[PDB]
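Feature request, filed as a ticket because there's no other form

It would be nice if the structure record came with a short human-readable summary line next to the tokens. Right now we just get the raw output. Example of a typical job, pasted below so the devs can see what we mean:
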Amino acid sequence: XNXXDVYCXXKYXX
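Raw output as currently delivered:
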């Protein structure tokens, strides 16, 4: 993702 502490494409991170 855009950094942080959340899900992206089905898991945490990215």
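Something like this underneath would help us a lot:
The chain is about 0% helix and 30% strand.
The longest strand covers residues 7-8.
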